[PDB]
Symmetry: C5
Subunit: 103 residues, 5 copies
Amino acid sequence: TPQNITDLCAEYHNTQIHTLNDKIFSYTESLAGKREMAIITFKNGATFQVEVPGSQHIDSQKKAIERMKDTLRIAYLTEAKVEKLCVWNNKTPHAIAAISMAN
Amino acid sequence: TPQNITDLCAEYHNTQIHTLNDKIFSYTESLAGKREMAIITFKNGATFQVEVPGSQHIDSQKKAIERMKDTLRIAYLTEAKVEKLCVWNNKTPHAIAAISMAN
Amino acid sequence: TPQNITDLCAEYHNTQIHTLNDKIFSYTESLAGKREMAIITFKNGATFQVEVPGSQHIDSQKKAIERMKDTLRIAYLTEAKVEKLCVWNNKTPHAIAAISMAN
Amino acid sequence: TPQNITDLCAEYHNTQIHTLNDKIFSYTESLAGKREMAIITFKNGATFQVEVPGSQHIDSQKKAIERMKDTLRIAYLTEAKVEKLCVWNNKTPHAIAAISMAN
Amino acid sequence: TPQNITDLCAEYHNTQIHTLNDKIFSYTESLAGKREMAIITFKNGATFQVEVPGSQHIDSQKKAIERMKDTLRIAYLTEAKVEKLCVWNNKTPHAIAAISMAN
């Protein structure tokens, strides 16, 4: 298994690492039909989503999508520094695949 | 895919944005039959609900409704500032579709 | 839908409002068979339960019963002020139907 | 329904009350197969388990077992004082049936 | 049942105890397909995973794997000291089987 987010991210196509080293500036979540998603931003203007679950996702990802939204909410509320995000860059906003937190 | 709450809200019929920029004043939840819901208020008097799950909701919204009540409870307890709510205005109290949190 | 806990409470028989305006003094939880319940008290001694799920409950209430126990535990640990409880008074201890928190 | 943990405990065979009036000293949890359980200790050395779910358990206890592990973890992390435990004493470590927390 | 993490760990083949007595330095989680996992590190460089649920795991472990990831997240965010990890050391990074928190 990968030992860090960068190596993990590199195992997939259409991804990139963003380095934030900053707490989340805003947290948005929606229960509206077909937009059951979360959106975060950072003070540098960067915006990211956790995608609406869809046919691109495999079954094993469903619980992990829900966990990620849990993680972003509590990170936001505790002002935890986000080190890096692994994202898919073929979506707008870029779609979160992985998160690391440090410092 | 929308990049913020305002753009997301605009995709739906019978919605509007309320700007609060304030912590939640009160949090109420019920387990009584047919009233399994949450109600929040702000010190300006504004009252909002998370609706009881019903036939106006698609399968994908059900988990998101449960998440929203989780979010409102922990926002209330941490005194997190609510920036905006996207609501359906064809319900009373107006029914929450989305929330953004920021300072 | 109801604007507040008092109006919600009045939609049901065998209920009353207790106004506490105080934090929970004690929290008790059981996994023992046929007693899978929570009990709370306030400083004055008044005692309330979240009932064991039973025949009186409709299916939609089951997730709400679990949420209520989650709410009581975190309210207890954070010393959140409980404003009101809506309770069924045909049980002993009185059985919680709804809770409002406000500072 | 019982008004408190001591009365609840007395409804069962093979139980006793431990009065700790102390925070949890250590919290242990395992995902290893057939040992999916939690263990806590107190500074006095007293050790308690949440049992692995088994044939002795009824369906209604499954969620409550998960909830108790949730409760012990957050009590441990918040340094919440544990008042009493109701335990089954026909197991080693003694198996938790119920917990009370008070200031 | 085992009374502590060291004795639990010894019940299994291909395990060892690591003694950290330190808070988690970094927390990483992924929702990417086939890498639905968490990774933690300590400041001494030690790196550990919660393995992706697979066919090595029995059904009772599935909920416990999710719980473990919940625990590591909240331990990280609260700066809780991790005492020991029981790991399988036939995986790289070593795969977490159990955790103890004290002190």
